[PDB]
Amino acid sequence: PQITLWKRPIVTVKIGGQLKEALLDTGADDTVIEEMNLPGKWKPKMIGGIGGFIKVRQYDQIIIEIAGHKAIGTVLVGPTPVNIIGRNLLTQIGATLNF
Amino acid sequence: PQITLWKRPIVTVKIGGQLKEALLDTGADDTVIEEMNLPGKWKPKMIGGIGGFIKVRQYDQIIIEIAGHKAIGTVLVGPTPVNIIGRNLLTQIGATLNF
Numbered sequence: 001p002q003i004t005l006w007k008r009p010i011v012t013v014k015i016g017g018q019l020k021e022a023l024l025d026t027g028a029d030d031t032v033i034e035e036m037n038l039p040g041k042w043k044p045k046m047i048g049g050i051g052g053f054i055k056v057r058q059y060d061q062i063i064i065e066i067a068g069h070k071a072i073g074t075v076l077v078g079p080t081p082v083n084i085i086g087r088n089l090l091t092q093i094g095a096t097l098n099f
Numbered sequence: 100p101q102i103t104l105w106k107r108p109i110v111t112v113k114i115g116g117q118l119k120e121a122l123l124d125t126g127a128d129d130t131v132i133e134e135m136n137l138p139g140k141w142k143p144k145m146i147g148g149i150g151g152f153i154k155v156r157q158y159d160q161i162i163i164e165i166a167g168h169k170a171i172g173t174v175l176v177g178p179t180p181v182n183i184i185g186r187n188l189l190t191q192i193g194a195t196l197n198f
């Protein structure tokens with residue numbers, strides 16, 4: 001599909017058995033999902049955005065479907081204001097920026 | 100151009116006549132550039148992201164060239180971690196996400 005940027009590029013994703021809305025974000029190295037009680041082992045991480053760093057839990061090998069496209073990779077879980085799909089997963093669904 | 104996302108989508112821009120590197124950022128509402136001297140009138144603004152909010156100078160109707168493509172719009176100048184081109188200018192250069 002093609003997504004214009006007149007509005008936030010938000011699509012439905014499936015993760016951990018739940019559907020969520022998430023922002024397709026070329027400016028994000030990582031994928032950051034709002035607090036959810038995901039199963040399994042995780043690793044402490046801190047990630048930096050415009051205003052500073054936040055603490056998140058790093059889950060690896062997480063299955064995530066993005067707008068119908070299956071992917072698997074690292075998902076960070078923590079107190080983010082918005083669900084963010086980052087380049088680590090955007091590459092897996094073959095996304096590009098075009099102009 | 101078509102730009103893939105294995106690396107950060109950084110391009111060269113020209114603002115105030117000065118060359119800078121900037122991140123093409125579909126997850127940013129606004130364009131935010133590192134502190135610099137910029138010709139034009141400005142007013143105080145605050146913007147937020149991961150980590151919270153920062154104070155910026157809002158410059159309106161600023162001429163900026165992005166990878167050879169012309170835009171004239173709002174540029175926020177402040178202590179951003181990296182130079183960011185947001186949707187307000189991405190739409191001007193006709194950028195879309197595709198997969």
Ligand SMILES: COC(=O)N[C@H](C(=O)N[C@@H](Cc1ccccc1)[C@@H](O)CN(Cc1ccc(-c2ccccn2)cc1)NC(=O)[C@@H](NC(=O)OC)C(C)(C)C)C(C)(C)C
Pocket residue numbers: 025026027028029030031032047048049050081082084086124125126127128129130131146147148149180181183185
């Ligand atoms: C290498 O670090 C990163 O990649 N950091 C990423 C990051 O912060 N991405 C930023 C760009 C960036 C890159 C490197 C250092 C600092 C900033 C954006 O791609 C995503 N971020 C993610 C984000 C998007 C929306 C919101 C939000 C909050 C309340 C209501 C609506 N939206 C908060 C954070 N967007 C914003 O912060 C934008 N915010 C915005 O458009 O606000 C409306 C700005 C920029 C215009 C301030 C993540 C933490 C998400 C992984």
